[PDB]
């Protein structure tokens, strides 16, 4: 009886609520049917038509004037910042253990760099990259240029000694580390195409397709 008379008291008062709701909807529908044009005749019959603004106008020039963004955030505790990184270090560690179970063309930029000098052309290119980034597809092309141009230079010369070559070389290493943490799909495409080309060259000529550039290719991808 309690599950019936409640169902009775509900739906009765629900339909009572529904009929009342439908009545107001019908009144609004009637308001849009005849009272709508009557309201148009209503407006044709009836008729009904500073200092802070100056301060606002003064603030209007105080809005297009000078500006400086420095909205800092909270303060990171030393242990707290240390722990999250330790957590971040750990998060890739078990993931490793779980893994232990399961600007465009080369010569377009090579001629640009050869005209320059590879002692700081990297830093110059880093600026050129940062410029583009300030404006990711071009960055992927840039990383492709970086890779094949590193291979190119290592193929080209060894006149720069261990204290003239390794400087810009490790600069390229750090640059490509950053661009690896930023971009990975393109890098994989680059390495895969290069290794297929490696095989093709080897197959055409076993020993006559060796490269120091290939050596440093292996080394850099291994430390990457």
């Amino acid at each position: 009886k309690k599950t019936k008379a409640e169902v009775m008291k509900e739906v009765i008062a629900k339909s009572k609520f529904y009929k009342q709701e439908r009545q107001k909807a019908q009144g609004i529908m009637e308001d849009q049917i005849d009272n709508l044009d009557d309201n148009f005749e209503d407006v044709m019959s009836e008729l009904m038509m500073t200092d802070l603004d100056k301060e606002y106008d003064i603030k209007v020039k105080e809005l297009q004037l000078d500006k400086r963004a420095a909205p800092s955030d909270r303060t990171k505790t030393e242990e707290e910042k240390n722990a999250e990184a330790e957590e971040k270090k750990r998060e890739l560690e078990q993931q490793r253990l779980d893994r232990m179970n399961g600007r465009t063309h080369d010569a377009l930029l090579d001629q640009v760099k050869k005209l320059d000098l590879d002692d700081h052309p990297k830093i110059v290119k880093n600026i050129i990259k940062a410029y583009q980034p300030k404006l990711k597809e071009k960055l992927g092309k840039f990383t492709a240029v970086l890779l094949r141009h590193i291979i190119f230079l290592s193929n080209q010369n060894y006149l720069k000694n261990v204290q003239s070559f390794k400087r810009t070389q490790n600069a390229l290493i750090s640059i490509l580390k950053s661009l690896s943490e930023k971009y990975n799909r393109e890098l994989s495409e680059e390495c895969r195409d290069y290794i297929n080309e490696m095989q093709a060259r080897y197959k055409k000529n076993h020993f006559d397709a060796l490269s120091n550039g290939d050596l440093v290719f292996f080394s850099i991808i291994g430390i990457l």
Binding site: V43, M48, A70
Partner: protein, 261 residues
């Protein structure tokens, strides 16, 4: 002197809007925004007794079709009074969801609502709960840089008050742009809050609240580089003489990490 058909249509539309909860709005109400005597039609239809959802819809229609001045006048003369009445006589001082939606729309189109309500709420003396709700709504839906700077300059040039200080605290949480003139206005407000050792007003000896202390702390955390050497020294002096006991450390840290522009 109004027509009988006009009065009957206005009363019927007001009753239909008050009793309406869901569905479509009337075509009379839709063409009211494209009419001249909108304020008179709304007064005849009694929008204070109408539905908050219908009021939010009418405000959106006026902001999307009608003019800015008529929208500001309607927004002030309906929404400010309705929000004040709802805040004063709510069951637990709770704001309506549809009214909050209308206020968010009015903040998204801030060329009208500022001069309609923001100066009017401070002039009418909004309570602590009303000021807190206004600050929360502003922080949820802020406005463009020009409107935010105009509102901040108006609130700073207005006298010291609990609602104005709470509005300043919410604006500092939003962290809008402060030019040289806005930073000068903030420094002048801080100097007026600080005492003057010959003629002094009331804020020189008036106590400052925790809301004002938090507003000063957020302003120091946000616009440290927008204050020069003299302005940073004045801010540090204000935070030492009339600053808080527990916010003095963060205030001095910000005033020393700030750089002259």
């Amino acid at each position: 002197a109004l027509p009988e058909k006009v009065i009957k249509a206005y009363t019927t539309v007001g009753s239909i809007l008050k009793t309406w909860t869901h569905g479509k709005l009337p075509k009379l109400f839709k063409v009211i925004p494209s009419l001249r005597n909108w304020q008179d039609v709304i007064y005849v239809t009694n929008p204070e007794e109408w539905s908050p959802h219908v009021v939010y819809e009418a405000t959106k229609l006026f902001v999307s079709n009608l003019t800015a001045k008529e929208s500001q006048k309607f927004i002030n003369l309906i929404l400010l009074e309705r929000f004040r009445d709802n805040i004063e006589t709510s069951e637990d001082h709770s704001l309506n969801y549809h009214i909050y939606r209308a206020v968010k729309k009015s903040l998204y189109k801030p060329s009208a609502f500022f001069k309609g309500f923001l100066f009017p709420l401070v002039e009418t003396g909004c309570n602590v709960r009303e000021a807190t709700i206004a600050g929360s709504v502003l922080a949820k839906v802020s406005v463009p840089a020009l409107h935010s700077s105009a509102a901040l300059s108006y609130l700073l040039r207005l006298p010291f008050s609990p609602p104005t200080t709470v509005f300043i605290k919410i604006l500092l949480d939003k962290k809008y742009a402060l030019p040289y003139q806005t930073v000068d206005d903030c420094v002048y407000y801080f100097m007026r809050f600080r005492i003057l050792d010959g003629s002094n007003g009331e804020d020189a000896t008036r106590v400052l609240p925790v809301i004002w202390h938090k507003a000063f702390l957020t302003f120091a955390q946000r616009y440290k580089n927008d204050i020069t050497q003299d302005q940073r020294d004045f801010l540090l002096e204000t935070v030492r003489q009339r600053g808080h006991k527990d916010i003095g450390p963060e205030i001095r840290r910000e005033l020393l990490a700030g750089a002259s522009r």
